[PDB]
Design a protein around this ligand. Structure first.
Ligand SMILES: [Zn+2]
Length: 42
């Protein structure tokens, strides 16, 4: 379900744009947030 208000899991990465169902997740994420990705893939 969804509510009609803001302030839902403030922790939201912007570099790649990935959310997390749990908390204190973005923390460890930033740790392994090195390198980039492009359309070119194997
Ligand atoms: Zn990210």
């Amino acid at each position: 379900g969804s509510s009609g208000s803001s302030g839902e899991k403030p922790y939201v990465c912007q570099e790649c744009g990935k959310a997390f169902t749990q908390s204190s997740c973005l923390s460890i994420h930033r740790r392994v947030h090195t390198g980039e990705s492009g359309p070119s893939s194997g």
